[PDB]
UniProtKB/Swiss-Prot annotation, chain A:
Protein name listed in UniProt: Proteasome subunit alpha type-5
Primary location group: cytoplasm
Subunit structure: The 26S proteasome consists of a 20S proteasome core and two 19S regulatory subunits. The 20S proteasome core is composed of 28 subunits that are arranged in four stacked rings, resulting in a barrel-shaped structure. The two end rings are each formed by seven alpha subunits, and the two central rings are each formed by seven beta subunits. The catalytic chamber with the active sites is on the inside of the barrel.
Functional description taken from the UniProt entry: The proteasome degrades poly-ubiquitinated proteins in the cytoplasm and in the nucleus. It is essential for the regulated turnover of proteins and for the removal of misfolded proteins. The proteasome is a multicatalytic proteinase complex that is characterized by its ability to cleave peptides with Arg, Phe, Tyr, Leu, and Glu adjacent to the leaving group at neutral or slightly basic pH. It has an ATP-dependent proteolytic activity.
Keyword rRNA processing: no
Pfam families cross-referenced by the UniProt entry: Proteasome (PF00227), Proteasome_A_N (PF10584)
Similarity remark: Belongs to the peptidase T1A family.
Matching PANTHER family: PROTEASOME SUBUNIT ALPHA/BETA (PTHR11599)
Sites bearing Phosphothreonine, chain numbering: T47
Keywords, ordered alphabetically: Cytoplasm, Nucleus, Phosphoprotein, Proteasome
In-chain residues carrying the UniProt-annotated modification Phosphoserine: S48
GO cellular component: nucleus; proteasome complex; proteasome core complex, alpha-subunit complex; proteasome storage granule
Upper lineage: Eukaryota, Fungi, Dikarya, Ascomycota, Saccharomycotina
Segments forming a coiled coil: none
UniProtKB/Swiss-Prot annotation, chain C:
Residues of the full protein shown: 20 to 130 of 241
Any one cellular-component term (Gene Ontology): proteasome complex
Domain of life (superkingdom): Eukaryota
Gene: PRE7
Function according to Swiss-Prot or TrEMBL: Non-catalytic component of the proteasome which degrades poly-ubiquitinated proteins in the cytoplasm and in the nucleus. It is essential for the regulated turnover of proteins and for the removal of misfolded proteins. The proteasome is a multicatalytic proteinase complex that is characterized by its ability to cleave peptides with Arg, Phe, Tyr, Leu, and Glu adjacent to the leaving group at neutral or slightly basic pH. It has an ATP-dependent proteolytic activity.
Annotated protein name in UniProt: Proteasome subunit beta type-6
Family recorded in the similarity comment: Belongs to the peptidase T1B family.
Cell compartments where the protein resides: Cytoplasm; Nucleus
Swiss-Prot record, chain G:
Pfam families referenced in this protein's UniProt entry, alphabetically: Proteasome (PF00227), Proteasome_A_N (PF10584)
PROSITE patterns the record matches: PROTEASOME_ALPHA_1 (PS00388), PROTEASOME_ALPHA_2 (PS51475)
Organism: Saccharomyces cerevisiae (strain ATCC 204508 / S288c) (Baker's yeast)
Residue location of crosslink Glycyl lysine isopeptide (Lys-Gly) (interchain with G-Cter in ubiquitin): K190
Function: The proteasome degrades poly-ubiquitinated proteins in the cytoplasm and in the nucleus. It is essential for the regulated turnover of proteins and for the removal of misfolded proteins. The proteasome is a multicatalytic proteinase complex that is characterized by its ability to cleave peptides with Arg, Phe, Tyr, Leu, and Glu adjacent to the leaving group at neutral or slightly basic pH. It has an ATP-dependent proteolytic activity.
Entry keywords, A to Z: Cytoplasm, Isopeptide bond, Nucleus, Phosphoprotein, Proteasome, Ubl conjugation
GO cellular component: nucleus; proteasome complex; proteasome core complex, alpha-subunit complex; proteasome storage granule
Main localization category: cytoplasm
Protein's name in the database: Proteasome subunit alpha type-6
Cellular compartments annotated: Cytoplasm; Nucleus
GO biological process assignments: proteasomal ubiquitin-independent protein catabolic process; proteasome-mediated ubiquitin-dependent protein catabolic process
SMART domains: Proteasome_A_N
Swiss-Prot record, chain I:
The protein's name in its UniProt record: Proteasome subunit beta type-4
GO annotation, cellular component aspect: cytosol; endoplasmic reticulum membrane; nucleus; proteasome complex; proteasome core complex, beta-subunit complex
GO terms, biological process: proteasomal ubiquitin-independent protein catabolic process; proteasome-mediated ubiquitin-dependent protein catabolic process
Main location: cytoplasm
Physiological role: Non-catalytic component of the proteasome which degrades poly-ubiquitinated proteins in the cytoplasm and in the nucleus. It is essential for the regulated turnover of proteins and for the removal of misfolded proteins. The proteasome is a multicatalytic proteinase complex that is characterized by its ability to cleave peptides with Arg, Phe, Tyr, Leu, and Glu adjacent to the leaving group at neutral or slightly basic pH. It has an ATP-dependent proteolytic activity. This subunit has a chymotrypsin-like activity.
Miscellaneous comment: Present with 21800 molecules/cell in log phase SD medium.
A single GO molecular function term of this UniProt record: endopeptidase activator activity
Annotated organism of origin: Saccharomyces cerevisiae (strain ATCC 204508 / S288c) (Baker's yeast)
């Protein structure tokens, strides 16, 4: 056949580029970073009405000051979350302090290129790259509120706002215009909820969409369905206003 | 059918290994390098293509020393040559550690020979993309060797490989005929400079830098040393005079 | 039978002020009843405004200080030149020392 | 389906093409070698061809001193020849150390043949494109010639020949042994056995040899040695004073 | 030794080996699970390619992982055993360290993790198996029902089916299962399960096996007669119209 | 590299089938037919020897009926060499269980273990599966007389009567026709021979082409007895049943 | 032709080429431009940082390896992280064992040999990144160019990445000028900014876009980003 | 480096054939004819010494090999494959039996051990099957005389008489006519020499024929006296002279 | 050390195990249950080294409970004891052996007969009408040699234990803080909560 860590004539890794195609078929995930906190929102996308929606866990806690949302082959994420949670707690054990959001992200991305059939470097025993992209949102005392996009390429970008999944290119163009440096946390909540409603195939309600935030004070919290339901009601009223 | 040239260790119906013969093309593509065996030592010289004025003169050294008595120069893929000398150095250290005496040149030759030959036994490795000219002084006289990607090597009076190997070999053949009593170390350095300048005409588009080294029993106490300053200029001038 | 440990003597003293701190130590290095050196520094600037001294077996002391100095260098590389807080250094040294719990560094260390 | 010619697996005809192509590599050097047994010696003659004037003729050899007693001449490329040589030397040294007596010619032959057989069955190892002719005066069997090939085949010979014009040298020696009715060269001195080997080499190939065109190895009781250019010249002068 | 990457991405961002593993599940015999107010029921159809089997010894479709949790499956029977064994071992390992039986969610999350690991490990193919894991968390009366698939994805269902003609029996459950009023009795919970299988099984008294799980490790498998009674009563519901 | 020559024995087809398992079953479909029949008072194993000669020593011959335990035997269909590898491991597992618990292994536990080994070659290792189908005839004090079957897929099932190897479709129809639950061993011996006699690809069903075994609990004992029939004993039962 | 001999790095082409290596070299040309140049006293790295969106950050291009050595990347960032991390260890090993700052020339030799091993073994892939290493050792200021092929070259100045030929021609012309900028860091940086700006086309180098590093006689390897590079735009 | 061939080179084809085993059996068919006949009081195994050159010494190549003092082996197909199988067979007789039970293995079990080695070459990673069929003749106290055939598949069967290689089809037919359950060892050697004459094209004498028997104990071949229980090896290779003596009564 | 007694009567096995756990010159607990239920009709009491004692018991319990679920069947008391003996017989030649002595009391539902197995840390198994581990045996075996009958009821069996405990409370140096008594019969395992004064 052809090697799993083979270069294309255009100087790209085939398996990484095919991995990015899998992520485009995934459920939409949106992150917005403000000076009041970072908001993470995801499309649940239940395949059947019999599927108990609240069992869909696409936003997960890494530590009290770091959360992350996933998009693509969500099963692949489990071992990435496990490494991230271990890296964060392990760092706290060694240095009696919270891990830097950037350093946590860099640790998760170190896994990404550990694939091959015996590549001459170390011992990368993993048959393929990850089929999932992560939006890692957190706070630290050094660089404040941060949002990171972690790809299976092993590169990570810091975004003021970022959308990944099926409706990404559409949502990203919307975030381009709507984001300013002086957004409030509430403004960012409605904005994620608005852009999700736009790209979601289903009508957005408190069952097929989930919000979460990370603030310096209360840390990373997943919004319960009652709290999200009122923010949806608040959105519709402000859209119908003009 | 075909496909006999897609895997390293595969024999073609005519009993050839095409992957080895393709490695030879990488060598032929490379810079020209020579070796001259004089009456009590050996002289190594190589062409250094100056890509631009940005290359720091006299800095990007190509000729490598093994132990303190062996010189190695190669043509083709420079990294592959470095990998072979790295092995050669480990190989020479291993020998000296057990037997005390510094490795004889024939002994060292077979050590490189067996290692290069090993990279033609399996499809999981690529053959070496370099022909290496090496040698020095040991217990019983001076020795000059040339090692092909196949693992094939012989002893030589003179050796040449790379871009302008024909020009070189032709000039070497003239020296062997016109000096049956043997060339001197001093003379062999001047003569090496000329042959590089003459063999450069197969690459005359790009300006080049000359690099010579030698291992003489009388002139360097049987240690590998680089030709520098006055003796280098004297050799460059001898070549620049006889190119016209 | 070979004894891996020795005693190079010396004494170290740390006092904390309201807005300052001192780490002092004698410069004498000894073996049994012989003086090795009258001036062999024992207290070291490790960077990030941390001073360290591992007194007891000089070899194990130098080894520990050397590994911690190296630990500070790699903290900078791995966490965007962030300053290693004194509390973070303390916890890091606990792991350096407990790493050799069953072949210990024969030193009493103060930072 | 068509990869049964790339690795050492069976073709539908029950054939190993990589073994057959390895045999083809043995003639790449275009060198002919023969071995004959004397009354108490074994002689190997090989053609010595030095095309390049820049080559050091003294270093060009396809005859190897494996042990004090065993000599080996190779037909094939020198890298594979030297691979086989170093292995035989290592196996001869190890045997002596473990079993407390010099490895016999036929046992080294069997051992080297068994190694070749493994490359014939395991995919990741290619066969060596060489034919190894081992010679000695064994302390049990006397004058001995044993030859191995890339297939892992080996057998003892009264005399043998290897290379492109193998068949011509073979039939020449055959016809001599049909006539003499004996299985060796009836001669006391090895010098005359070398002269015989060179004489029948000339007769079969139909080529005259100078001192630098040949390469000779002699095995006697408790030593194997190669002849110098001047030892061969003395041999070439002797055969000249008969024709 | 063997570490050849069998599960890899294709140009369109698909892992064909995981995709073809789901096709092995589609081939497998239908399995269904509905959860009532105070119980979960697992129904599975039996094949009829060869009929001369000893039903005493032939491995049954619903396996006990612990005394309080059960696992049914659709796909390769051989593959299912390796997952069931690993689950049963983990169930005991959890009890030994945490001093508490596994939650149904935890046991599922483990089995899901195993299936996932075989999708990006060298020299292995994914499991040709989807599972329905059902039971009650320790000292809990809230019924639990989870599904896993070869990809390693898992989630909980009010009711779900997997295997051959799962498309049909899911359609039935979607327009027969009210989340407002789940089957309040054990009886009417089993009735809805058999009804859903009868859509696919095509007159199968001996071709339908049912397992009822109630709180506090109360698991029982219904006999042919007990199920045959439900089949008799359901066929009268149709004929009385 | 080596990737070029990898068959990939453990992959799914687009339809979700295991190529090697399917082709291994095709191999077994050509092997000599083997039948198991479970009665109220014992079990019968009958197998047809594929290919025979006048010069084939039948007295010292065993190619289909092997003894795993004092209470468990197997009928083989496929590669004899492959079967002997699995039989040897199955014999060991039975002895490991006895050493551990001081009780003879229950039939299903042995069958599941062998079936789990076959499943291994199906999911990992990149090796060909075992071209073998087994009929397990055994007795334990839990389920009494048991008859199992296993195939290269590593899937196993229990039966009242079953056939493996050649013409299973025809053989299974004839068994399903004449089998009753209240059957005796002597009735099962007859049924087994009648079925083989009508599915045979040869002229007549003679003694020299048959292997026969029964697992009975001889009433005048109270313990289970395995009887692998001798050539003369097969010749006798062949005349009594009315096949001469 | 090419399609049959580019499956892996272990395969030579009939012309004697390694296509997997050449494909890795292609990943560099697609990478954002970075420039290196040295006098006798100082060595400067000037790198153009690239952004994904206007909402994203400009990915860092310069990594510190020791107090006296550092490098700029062009191509795959993870491969730059692996090689830079290896070079950090070799600099670190030299310090701890020999109490010796690792010579820039020897740092080059080690990167060369590490890259080479990925080009001769099956299963492995070449590194998909080019590196410009600067350092002040015992033999003055140094600039190295690293290529995934394993080829390392000591130069007065150079540039790698997209439109890198623009800067390389400028430096080849300015050679006699900038080589003599001794004991003036600000003038050597300005000469490096005038070099990289010769490879612009899309935009003009802004504050959070430009990345500069310097090492020299009495200057430890320090990276300037943002506000700190405002006086060079 | 490293054997990266960790996968099977023998795989089931859609028809259910194992290609490499079938192709191995084809290689066996091309091989020189070898046969075995079992008598009441012994077994005989015979083959033709196909000399690859008249300069070659046919004596220095044993196609018939002693495995144990009571077990002998002969083959048809690839000589090198046979040579390494004999080496492994001799060693496994010691490691897996004699070093445990303090006696040589019975014929059927040593055959079973050779069968296993050849089965592993059929399934193990990065290997081809052995291109030989073996005929193993042996004696043991509790089974008496026995003769076994072993094929590349690893399958083995006991024979009263059989042949393998070139003219096996014709040779098997001639043995079916001449064999009875009352043959003496001398009668079996006579039948063996008759059967092998039909296979041989050129010279048919003691120097071109290799023949060995598993018969009575040879106390003269033991090499020591004084242990009554040790009566000597049952395996004996007939000399060039001993064959020619029986060829005059052909 | 700790007191581990077992007694097999007509239709049951009775296990009596001391409630005291002591480190140094302190009795840390006076209500310790030195037994684990391996299966509904098999009980194992244990005594020995501080850590090894419970770690080994829970390890055996885990393995038997795993087997029970896999086979949906209860292993015979004989089968369980044979498994335990082999684990100890492995342990004794390992880097650090389990220093644990066990009694296994089980009702074989197949044979309809109670069974008591005594196994020491070496892996020395034996089936007995009555058993003891450590120093208890030195006084209890001669008592039971005298007063034991095989046809005794469970009630007679408890009276015979009460007599053994009274003797150990009179002549043994250490305060073992009474015993927890458990009956293993056809109906499974129950605890005699009223042995403080029966
Ligand atoms: Cl060997
Ligand atoms: Mg005891």
């Amino acid at each position: 056949d052809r090697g799993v860590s083979t270069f294309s004539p255009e100087g790209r890794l085939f398996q990484v580029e095919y991995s990015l195609e899998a992520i485009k078929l995934g459920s939409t995930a949106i992150g917005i970073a403000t000076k009041e906190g970072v908001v993470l929102g995801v499309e649940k996308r239940a395949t059947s009405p019999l599927l108990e929606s609240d069992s869909i866990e696409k936003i997960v806690e890494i530590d009290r000051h770091i959360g992350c949302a996933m998009s693509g082959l969500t099963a692949d994420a489990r071992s990435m979350i496990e490494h991230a949670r271990t890296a964060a707690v392990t760092h706290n054990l060694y240095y009696d302090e919270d891990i830097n959001v950037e350093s946590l992200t860099q640790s998760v991305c170190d896994l990404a290129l550990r694939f091959g059939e015996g590549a001459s470097g170390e011992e990368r025993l993993m048959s393929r790259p990850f089929g999932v992209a992560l939006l890692i949102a957190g706070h630290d005392a050094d660089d404040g509120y941060q949002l990171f996009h972690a790809e299976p390429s092993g590169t990570f970008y810091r975004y003021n706002a970022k959308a990944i999944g099926s409706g990404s290119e559409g949502a990203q163009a919307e975030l381009l215009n709507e984001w300013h440096s002086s957004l409030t946390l509430k403004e960012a909540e409605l904005l994620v909820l608005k852009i999700l409603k736009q790209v979601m195939e289903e009508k957005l309600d408190e069952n097929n969409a989930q919000l979460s935030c990370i603030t310096k004070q209360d840390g990373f919290k997943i919004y319960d369905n009652e709290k999200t339901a009122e923010l949806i009601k608040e959105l519709k009223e402000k859209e119908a206003a003009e | 059918g075909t496909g006999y040239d897609l895997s390293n260790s595969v024999f073609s119906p005519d009993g050839r290994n095409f992957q080895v013969e393709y490695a030879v093309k990488a060598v032929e593509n490379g810079t020209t390098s020579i070796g001259i065996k004089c009456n009590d030592g050996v002289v190594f010289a190589v062409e250094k293509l100056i890509t631009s004025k940005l290359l720091v003169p006299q800095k990007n050294v190509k000729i490598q020393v093994v132990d303190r008595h062996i010189g190695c120069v190669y043509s083709g893929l420079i990294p592959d040559g470095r990998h072979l000398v790295n092995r050669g150095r480990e190989e020479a250290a291993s020998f000296k550690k057990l037997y005390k005496t510094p490795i004889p040149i024939p002994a060292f030759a077979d050590r490189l020979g067996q290692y290069v030959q090993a990279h033609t036994l399996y499809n999981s490795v690529r053959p070496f993309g370099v022909s290496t000219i090496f040698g020095g002084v040991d217990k019983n006289g001076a020795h000059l060797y040339m090692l092909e990607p196949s693992g094939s090597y012989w002893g030589y009076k003179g050796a040449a490989t790379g871009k302008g190997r024909q020009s070189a070999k032709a000039e070497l053949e003239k020296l062997v005929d016109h000096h049956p009593e043997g060339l001197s170390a001093r003379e062999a350095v001047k003569q090496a400079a000329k042959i590089i300048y003459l063999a450069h005409e197969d690459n005359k588009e790009k300006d080049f830098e000359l690099e010579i080294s030698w291992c003489s029993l009388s002139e360097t106490n049987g240690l590998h040393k680089f030709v520098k300053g006055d003796l280098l200029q004297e050799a460059i001038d001898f070549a620049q005079k006889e190119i016209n | 039978q070979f004894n891996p440990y020795g005693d190079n003597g010396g004494t170290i003293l740390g006092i904390a002020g309201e807005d300052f701190a001192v780490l002092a130590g004698d410069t004498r290095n000894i073996t049994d009843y012989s003086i090795n050196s009258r001036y062999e520094p024992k207290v070291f600037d490790c960077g990030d405004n941390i001073v360290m001294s591992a007194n007891g077996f000089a070899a194990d002391g130098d080894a520990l200080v050397k590994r911690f100095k190296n630990s500070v260098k790699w903290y900078h590389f791995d966490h965007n030149d962030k300053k290693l807080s004194i509390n973070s250094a303390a916890r890091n040294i606990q792991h350096l020392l407990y790493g050799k719990r069953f072949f210990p560094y024969y030193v009493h260390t103060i930072i | 389906a068509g990869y049964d010619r790339h690795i050492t697996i069976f073709s539908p005809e029950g054939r190993l093409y990589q073994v057959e192509y390895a045999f083809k590599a043995t003639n790449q050097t275009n060198i002919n070698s023969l071995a004959v047994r004397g009354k108490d010696c074994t002689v190997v003659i090989s053609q010595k061809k030095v095309p390049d004037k820049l080559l050091d003729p003294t270093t060009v050899s396809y005859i190897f001193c494996i042990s004090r007693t065993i000599g080996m001449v190779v037909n094939g490329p020198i890298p594979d020849a030297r691979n086989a040589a170093l292995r035989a030397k290592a196996e001869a040294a190890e045997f002596r150390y473990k079993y407390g007596y010099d490895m016999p010619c036929d046992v080294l032959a069997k051992r080297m043949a068994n190694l070749s057989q493994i490359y014939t069955q395991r995919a990741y190892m290619r066969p060596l494109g060489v034919i190894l002719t081992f010679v000695s005066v064994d302390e049990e069997l006397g004058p001995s010639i044993y030859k191995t090939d890339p297939a892992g085949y080996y057998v003892g010979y009264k005399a043998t020949a290897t290379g492109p014009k193998q068949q011509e040298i073979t039939t020449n020696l055959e016809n001599h042994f049909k006539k003499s009715k004996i299985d060796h060269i009836n001669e006391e001195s090895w010098e005359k056995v070398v002269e015989f080997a060179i004489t029948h080499m000339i007769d079969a190939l139909g080529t005259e040899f100078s001192k630098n065109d040949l390469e000779v190895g002699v095995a006697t009781k408790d030593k194997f040695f190669t002849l110098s250019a001047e030892n061969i010249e003395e041999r070439l002068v002797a055969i000249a004073e008969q024709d | 030794g063997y570490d050849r990457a069998l599960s890899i991405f294709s140009p369109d961002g698909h892992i064909f080996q995981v995709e073809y593993a789901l096709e092995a599940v589609k081939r497998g015999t239908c399995a269904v699970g509905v959860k009532g107010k105070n119980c979960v029921v697992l129904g599975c159809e039996r094949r009829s390619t060869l009929k001369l089997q000893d039903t005493r010894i032939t491995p049954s479709k619903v396996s006990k992982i612990d005394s309080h949790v059960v696992l049914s499956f659709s796909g390769l029977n051989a593959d299912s055993r390796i997952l069931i064994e690993k689950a049963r071992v983990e169930a005991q390992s959890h009890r030994l360290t945490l001093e508490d039986p596994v939650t149904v969610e935890y046991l599922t999350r483990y089995v899901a993790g195993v299936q996932q690991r075989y999708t990006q490990s060298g020299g292995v193919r994914p499991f040709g198996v989807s599972t329905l894991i059902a039971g009650f968390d320790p000292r809990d009366d809230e019924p639990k029902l989870y599904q896993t698939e070869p990809s390693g994805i898992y989630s909980s269902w009010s009711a779900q089916t997997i295997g051959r003609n799962s498309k049909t029996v899911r359609e039935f459950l979607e327009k027969n299962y009210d989340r407002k009023e789940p089957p309040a009795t054990v009886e009417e919970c089993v009735k809805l399960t058999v009804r859903s299988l009868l859509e696919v099984v095509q007159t199968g008294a001996k071709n339908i096996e049912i397992t009822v799980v109630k709180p506090d490790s109360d698991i029982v498998a219904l006999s042919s007669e007990e199920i045959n009674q439900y089949v008799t009563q359901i066929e009268q519901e149709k004929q009385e119209q | 590299g080596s990737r070029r020559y990898d068959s990939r024995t453990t992959i799914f087809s687009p339809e979700g089938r295991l190529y090697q398992v399917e082709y291994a079953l095709e191999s077994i479909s050509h092997a000599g037919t083997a039948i198991g029949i479970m009665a109220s008072d014992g079990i019968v194993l009958a197998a047809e020897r594929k290919v025979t000669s006048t010069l084939l020593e039948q007295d010292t011959s065993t190619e289909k009926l092997y003894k795993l335990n004092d209470k468990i035997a197997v009928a083989v269909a496929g590669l004899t060499a492959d079967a002997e590898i699995l039989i040897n491991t199955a014999r060991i597992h039975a002895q490991n269980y006895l050493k551990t618990y001081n009780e003879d292994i229950p039939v299903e536990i042995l069958v599941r273990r062998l079936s789990d080994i076959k499943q291994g070659y199906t999911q990992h290792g990149g090796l060909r599966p075992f071209g073998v189908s087994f009929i397990y005839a055994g007795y334990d004090d839990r389920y009494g007389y048991q008859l199992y079957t296993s195939n290269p897929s590593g899937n196993y099932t229990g039966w009242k009567a079953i056939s493996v190897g050649a013409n299973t479709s025809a053989a299974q129809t004839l068994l399903q026709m004449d089998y009753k639950d209240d059957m005796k061993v002597d009735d099962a011996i007859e049924l087994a021979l009648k079925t083989l006699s009508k599915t045979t690809d040869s002229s007549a069903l003679t003694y020299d082409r048959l292997e026969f075994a029964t697992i009975r609990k001889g009433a005048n004992d109270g313990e289970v007895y395995q009887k692998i029939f001798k050539p003369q004993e097969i010749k006798d039962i062949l005349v009594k049943t009315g096949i001469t | 032709f090419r399609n049959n001999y580019d499956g892996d790095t272990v395969t030579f082409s009939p012309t004697g080429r390694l296509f997997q290596v050449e494909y890795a070299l292609e990943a560099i040309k697609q990478g954002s431009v970075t420039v290196g140049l040295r006098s006798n006293t100082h060595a400067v790295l000037v790198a153009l940082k690239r952004n994904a969106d206007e909402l994203s950050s400009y990915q860092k291009k310069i990594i510190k390896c020791d107090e006296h050595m550092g490098l700029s990347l062009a191509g795959l960032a993870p491969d730059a992280r692996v090689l830079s991390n290896y070079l950090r260890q070799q600099c670190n090993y030299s310090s701890l064992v020999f109490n010796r700052k690792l010579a820039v020339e020897r740092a080059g030799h080690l990167l060369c040999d590490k890259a080479q091993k990925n080009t001769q073994s099956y299963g492995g892939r070449p590194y998909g990144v080019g590196l410009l290493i600067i350092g002040y050792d015992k033999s003055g200021a140094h600039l190295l160019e690293f290529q995934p092929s394993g080829n390392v070259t000591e130069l007065y100045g150079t540039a790698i990445g997209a439109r890198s030929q623009g800067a390389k021609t400028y430096l080849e012309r300015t050679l006699d000028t900038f080589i003599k900028i001794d004991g003036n860091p600000d003038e050597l940086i300005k000469a490096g900014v005038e070099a990289i700006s010769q490879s612009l086309r899309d935009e003009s180098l802004t504050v959070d876009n430009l990345s500069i590093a310097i090492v020299g006689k009495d200057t430890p390897f320090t990276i300037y980003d943002g506000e700190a590079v405002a006086k060079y735009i | 480096m490293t054997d990266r061939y960790s996968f099977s080179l023998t795989t089931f084809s859609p028809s259910g054939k194992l290609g490499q085993i079938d192709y191995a059996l084809t290689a066996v068919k091309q091989g020189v004819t070898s046969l075995g006949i079992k008598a009441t009081n012994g077994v005989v195994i015979a083959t033709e010494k196909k000399s690859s050159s008249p300069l070659a010494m046919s004596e220095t190549l044993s196609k018939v090999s002693l495995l144990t003092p009571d077990i002998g082996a002969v083959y048809s197909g690839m000589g090198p494959d046979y040579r390494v199988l004999v080496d492994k067979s001799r060693k496994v007789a010691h490691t897996s039996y004699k070093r445990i039970y303090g006696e040589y293995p019975p014929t059927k079990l040593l055959v079973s051990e050779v069968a296993k080695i050849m089965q592993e070459a059929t399934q193990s990673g990065g290997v081809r099957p052995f291109g030989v069929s073996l005929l193993i003749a042996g004696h043991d106290e509790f089974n008496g005389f026995s003769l076994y055939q072993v094929d590349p598949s690893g399958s083995y069967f006991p024979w009263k008489a059989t042949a393998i290689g070139k003219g096996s089809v014709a040779a098997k037919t001639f043995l079916e006519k001449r064999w009875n359950d009352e043959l003496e060892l001398e009668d079996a050697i006579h039948i063996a020499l008759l059967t092998l004459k039909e296979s041989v094209e050129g010279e048919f004498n003691g120097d071109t024929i290799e023949l060995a028997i598993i018969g009575d104990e040879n106390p003269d071949l033991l090499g020591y006296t004084g242990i009554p229980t040790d009566k000597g090896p049952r395996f004996r290779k007939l000399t060039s002279q001993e064959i020619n003596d029986r060829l005059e009564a052909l | 050390m700790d007191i581990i007694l077992g007694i097999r009567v007509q239709d049951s096995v009775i296990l009596a195990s001391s409630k005291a756990v002591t480190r140094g010159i302190s009795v840390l607990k006076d209500s310790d249950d030195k037994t684990r239920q391996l299966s509904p009709h098999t009980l194992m009491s244990f005594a020995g080294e501080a850590g090894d004692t419970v770690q080994f018991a829970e390890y055996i319990q885990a393995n038997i409970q795993l087997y029970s679920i896999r086979e949906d069947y209860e292993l015979s008391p004989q089968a369980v004891s044979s498994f335990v003996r082999q684990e100890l017989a492995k342990s004794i030649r390992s880097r650090r052996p389990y220093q644990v002595n066990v009694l296994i009391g089980g009702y074989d539902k197949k044979k309809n007969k109670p069974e008591l197995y005594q196994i020491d840390y070496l892996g020395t198994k034996v089936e007995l009408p009555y058993g003891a581990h450590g120093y208890s045996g030195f006084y209890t075996f001669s008592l039971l040699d005298h007063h034991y009958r095989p046809d005794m009821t469970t009630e007679e069996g408890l009276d015979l234990l009460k007599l053994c405990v009274q003797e150990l409370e009179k002549r043994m140096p250490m305060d073992f803080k009474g015993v927890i008594v458990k009956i293993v019969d056809k109906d499974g395992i129950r605890q005699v909560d009223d042995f403080q004064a029966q």
